[PDB]
Every structure is written in C-alpha cells, then in structure tokens.
Amino acid sequence: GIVEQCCTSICSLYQLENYCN
C-alpha cells in the first residue's frame, strides 16, 4: 500500500524507490 505508506505516512526518497521498476 503506497497510499497508506507515502500519503498516510512520510516517505523518504528511498521508501519511494521501492515502487519503481
């Protein structure tokens, strides 16, 4: 759940790269 992870919580450049290809 990226929404719960990055929009319902805080997201560093790294917790954001996980959702890349």
Partner 1 sequence: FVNQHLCXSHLVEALYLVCGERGFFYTPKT
Nearest to 20, CA basis, from 6, 10, 8, 9: 6
Residues 2-21 within binding reach of partner 1 (CB under 8 A): 2-4, 6-13, 16-17, 19-21
The CA angle 3-6-21, to the nearest 5 degrees, is 85
Please report how close the Cβ of residue 17 comes to partner 1 at its closest, in angstroms.
6
Tell me the site size for partner 1, rule CB under 8 A.
17
Please report how close the Cβ of residue 5 comes to partner 1 at its closest, in angstroms.
10
Binding site for partner 1 (CB under 8 A): 1-4, 6-13, 16-17, 19-21
